[PDB]
Amino acid sequence: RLVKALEDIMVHYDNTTRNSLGNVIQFIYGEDGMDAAHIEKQSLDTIGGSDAAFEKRYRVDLLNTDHTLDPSLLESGSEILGDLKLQVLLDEEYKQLVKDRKFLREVFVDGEANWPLPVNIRRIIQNAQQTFHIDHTKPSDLTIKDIVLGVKDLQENLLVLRGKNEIIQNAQRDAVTLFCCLLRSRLATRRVLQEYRLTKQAFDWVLSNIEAQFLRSVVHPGEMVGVLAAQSIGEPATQGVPRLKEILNVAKNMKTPSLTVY
Amino acid sequence: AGRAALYKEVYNVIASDGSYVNYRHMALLVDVMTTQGGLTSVTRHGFNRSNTGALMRCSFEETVEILFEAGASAELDDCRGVSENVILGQMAPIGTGAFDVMIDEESLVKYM
Amino acid sequence: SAPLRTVKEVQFGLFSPEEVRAISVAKIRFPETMQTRAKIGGLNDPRLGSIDRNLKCQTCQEGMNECPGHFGHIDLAKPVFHVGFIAKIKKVCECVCMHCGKLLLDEHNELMRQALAIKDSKKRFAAIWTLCKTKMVCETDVPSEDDPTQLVSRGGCGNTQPTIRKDGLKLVGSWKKLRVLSTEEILNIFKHISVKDFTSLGFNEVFSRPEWMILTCLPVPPPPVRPSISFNESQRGEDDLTFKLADILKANISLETLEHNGAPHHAIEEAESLLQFHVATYMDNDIAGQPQALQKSGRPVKSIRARLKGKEGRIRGNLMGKRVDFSARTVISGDPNLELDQVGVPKSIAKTLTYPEVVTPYNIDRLTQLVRNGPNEHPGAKYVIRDSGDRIDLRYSKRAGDIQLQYGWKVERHIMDNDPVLFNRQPSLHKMSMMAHRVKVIPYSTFRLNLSVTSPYNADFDGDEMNLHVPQSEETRAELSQLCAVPLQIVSPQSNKPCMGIVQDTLCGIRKLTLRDTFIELDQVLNMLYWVPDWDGVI
Amino acid sequence: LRFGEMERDCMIAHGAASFLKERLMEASDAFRVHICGICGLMTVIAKLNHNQFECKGCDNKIDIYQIHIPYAAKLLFQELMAMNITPRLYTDRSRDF
Amino acid sequence: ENGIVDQVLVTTNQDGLKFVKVRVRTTKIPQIGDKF
Amino acid sequence: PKDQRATTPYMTKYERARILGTRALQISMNAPVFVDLEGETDPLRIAMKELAEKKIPLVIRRYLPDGSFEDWSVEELIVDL
Amino acid sequence: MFFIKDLSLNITLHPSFFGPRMKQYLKTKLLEEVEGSCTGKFGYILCVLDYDNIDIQRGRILPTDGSAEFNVKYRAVVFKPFKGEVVDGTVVSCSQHGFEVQVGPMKVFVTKHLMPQDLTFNAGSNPPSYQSSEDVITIKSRIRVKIEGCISQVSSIHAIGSIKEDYLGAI
Amino acid sequence: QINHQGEEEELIALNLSEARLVIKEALVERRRAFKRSETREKELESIDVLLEQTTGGNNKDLKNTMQYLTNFSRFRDQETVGAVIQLLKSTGLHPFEVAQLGSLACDTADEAKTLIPSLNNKISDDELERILKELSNLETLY
RNA sequence: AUCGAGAGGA
DNA sequence: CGCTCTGCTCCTTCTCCTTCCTCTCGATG
DNA sequence: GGAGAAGGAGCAGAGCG
Ligand SMILES: [Mg+2]
Ligand SMILES: [Zn+2]
Ligand SMILES: [Zn+2]
Ligand SMILES: [Zn+2]
């Protein structure tokens, strides 16, 4: 019964989900345009932890002593310390991260910090570390300017849609909202410089890899999502269950109506 | 509001047994039952009573009754559905059949 | 011959009674079929689908192979209700002014203008019916909404209308001042309805006219729809449809005979119902009422509706799913020494399933050798197809050692190594249970699978059976390999997890093998390295 | 062996449309018919031996097309005609754009 | 089938109609795939 | 509407399937071959070789919901599968 | 009468014909089929206007097999008769019950039943023309005819001519 | 009417004499298509030569057709054909009616009315009178 | 051959 | 305030509804 | 036998006379 309901739903080349009549069911497949085969659970560090811990893990201050960048991390030491221009960039990054932290608090009320998102950033970075055995005991050659701008540049290339008009562009930004928040969490200036002491060549390799990985992960047009979704619910339904029958059939007269009052 | 509440109900039923299915799969189903501006069931009185191709509808649970209505109203099927092309024995507009391939004579000359 | 096209859209409608007569190639008149082998011209004659060895089929020849049937014509003595539309007739007549042809209500009532504004024809018809059905009078002068003091002289009849009731296969109307409605009367009423009312009622001028909902002539399906039956020792036992039609003709002839000879009015009334009964049951042998047409053997007659309706009918049983060739079914069993995407196909099967390979300059030599081997050996072929369609059978010819292949000829090559084949474990609960493997031929009668592939199939080696499907066109081979090949479903969208993995002994073995305590003597190691096909020769 | 409903559902999910058609047509039920352009009924008298064609009731001899459909489907339309339903099949979509 | 004829019986019912029954036997050896 | 094509420049796995099958069918029917032969007799395999060298002279007409379309040359499409 | 109209014909090419030289070959196949053709809708198809600028319109590979379809459009010159039309034709052959005359690319049978009542067959003439009246009509002579309805056929097209009129006489 | 290029072109009631001129032009283009690989007697042979060097001599029926149409062509000189085109078309005459008059002989308005029933009723005789002798003089010039 | 009924699996 | 009219509410009817395969057996025209 | 569609029947209030 379920399959016949969803038999004619497919993703067209404009990345929209329509039935046989052309009626639009979902403007973007699955609200993210991302295939289920190329998505996996990942952590969202910016959600959990105390505010002090969050600030410690992300905030960088080149002017004060609270969050001074250790000069031994990079070939450039004091040259970075005291540079207001670079401080402005760090403020913009931290500003954005603060917005994401409070933003995600609304998306996930329960505070859970693990959800399926495409492109395993953590795995890619480790592959970078072992790629050419980067020596994590010596200063790197990265610059805050390269780090900050590189992250922004990548976000631009996370193209799921192609329409140049504002309406499509607005959806494009909303398509990669959550995923971009993850990217900023694990590519922050402090973490990349301290936790993952990559070289400039290695860092550029990672960025170039993420976009390539992400594009491959976008759902493919012509997918017969309808039946695929129908079966994926039917299969586990063979293992509650009468309730499912009580749901798919509207059956106003339920078995155990109840309320939950807070 | 009902749609989101419907999703939450379906998710609990599936998750109660310890199994796990991706969010998008439920999202599509819960969405389909509400695109019609109301809780349209998936029974004989719900999805079946749609405005889709008659030739598609007739195969679900009522066949001869539906055919009579289609003839009376002179309904027309666009053959864009999957089951419709299955009956007619043609390539359905899905997967490899959702587009067309053509030969470029210009490139053919160039490839010489 | 004629241009080749493809169906683009399907338009439904009702036969126009004149059109039926135009289409038919012969008028059916006699319920009789035979004498000994000659056939009555007035029933299932050679002008319809001819029986085998009779190349007439309305001068179409080609036997039953390349020629379909053709429809006949029966002139009913009286009009009869179409079973499928009896309810619709009730609604329509409740809406028309009953011997005026106009609608009980008009555009001068605001309620319809909302209804007439509905784009959906079905809802439009339903909305109108809900209103007009309560309008029991069609007075001529209707006060205008804009000018209450002014009335519109629309209603031609100006009289009242009766409450139409469904009585078995006929309609009864209770006049508010009670009699059975005449079938011919309704036809007259429908013929007086303007095309403007057709649209408001949801009818199409050139495809569905209300009068066409009442049958005046029957299309007679040709033999291929109701095949000639010779199951027993040349006994007829013709299909139910054939016998059912004969009953209609008997009823029709009697009704015509009674009316013509003496006009025994009361007898005509019964004969009218009998014809109504036989035609109704013929089209549908399951009505709300008791009447159940029974065959001479006592079993209910299999009307047209029964053939289509329900599973195993003409939709679910033959169109959606159908029996197929180039397939096999047998018992499975595990085999560690086989890769994932591979399978063992018994020689006894590969020697039967065939693939139509096309002879080309790149493979003429190999194909030539296969034909030389012949169907007796495994690596051979069964048939050599000439360009003209000469399907040579190597099974019954010594020409296997004489035929010289020509470019463009097809060879029914046996299944050989690496030929993709699609599997299935009934039931096909979900996508993963249908995947494409590669063929390696083995000498025993079972299907060999790699152990780890049973997890998606949900299969088990306790005697479970499993089907095999062979593609035929080169296009399908590529389509299966690049979309349904085993390794392409390692990661399943079911749960975002690798559907397949190491299971059973292999999984148990690994734990011990990787245990910190396990050490391997040199002699054993040298064997292990060689087993790994990807070893690089470096100890 | 029956390629039942669930068997075709799997093919749809895999998106292998061409294979599904091949299974439903080349394996079995392959059948060539002729149709009238004026009316979508398989009433064409295909005098193949003479390369002559006609649709009595339309007096047409130029609007003839060949269509490949399952033999089982061909019965369905005929039985629908026997039901007094006219499954008119057209090879040209009415909607242009 | 593949075997040898064990015993051929010829008889008649109460109606005098001649009947023939043939019992054919063969040896089945445990093969690959047989259930136990 | 070649200007401003709004579809993906990447070849969806489905066109990869049909193109390989389609071109393979053409090769089996003795169609002219663009690439040199390395003893490769399996018509599908040549198609994969041809697709690697972008020697397939086919163009994809992708359809949109409204019935319009865009044309992509096999050369233009990016093969990342 | 002669007309200019844009004709479309669908050609199918076998894959072996997919070499670069196909374009010229496709044009070659078009000309043989279209040139000198008959049909009840447009009558006789004579030639193609604008031999070049042929709208090949890309080859649609048919999913069934490797052959591809070609929707070729082109202007064409065609002849279409009309009931009551007047043609200044000529006699092709003589006969006792009428004459075979030339009308455009079309043959018209001018029956004696539609000729002046005073005009009679004279078997003694060579060719066997009518001369009993002033309307002397032989093969070598000219004849203007009136088309009394067209009778089209599958292999060819012809019509019925008349001479018993104040116009459409001999020569 | 509408052509396959989406242009609402009216029915081209092309005249008999101008047809051969177009056929001439078209046939020369075919010969040019091969190359890169007036009195009625002169035109008859001219078109005869054109067909033989542009075709294989198979459709002789068409060769006889074009020869006989030339034998009865009336406005052969294309430069002067433009005059008859303007004379008839400038009056708003229905193009089908234009075809017959420019393709059939006529001297008087009554004669034009007599041959063409569509002209017997609504045509302005004065314009035919002026045009027809103008065309009759034009016809004699050939 | 079909239908109907039954037994047994997957 | 009774008459009337109308929609609302109540109260009975009245249909029409559920993977794959392999064997045997009796009974019909 | 269940569940939903359907059709009648009774009733009560709002406007009318
Ligand atoms: Mg099992
Ligand atoms: Zn026939
Ligand atoms: Zn009336
Ligand atoms: Zn027709």
Side-chain angles (χ1 to χ4, degrees), chain C residues 96-102 138 156-161 189:
Chain C
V96 180
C97 304
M98 271 276 288
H99 300 49
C100 192
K102 299 180 184 179
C138 60
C157 285
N159 61 4
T160 66
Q161 294 76 32
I189 294 167

Side-chain angles (χ1 to χ4, degrees), chain C residues 47-49 56-58 60 67-70:
Chain C
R47 292 175 294 185
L48 306 177
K56 174 61 176 173
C57 299
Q58 183 66 41
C60 299
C67 179
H70 317 282

Side-chain angles (χ1 to χ4, degrees), chain B residues 55-68:
Chain B
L55 189 43
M56 183 177 177
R57 292 189 296 272
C58 65
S59 66
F60 173 78
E61 286 183 359
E62 290 178 339
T63 311
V64 169
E65 192 275 359
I66 301 299
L67 268 297
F68 294 156

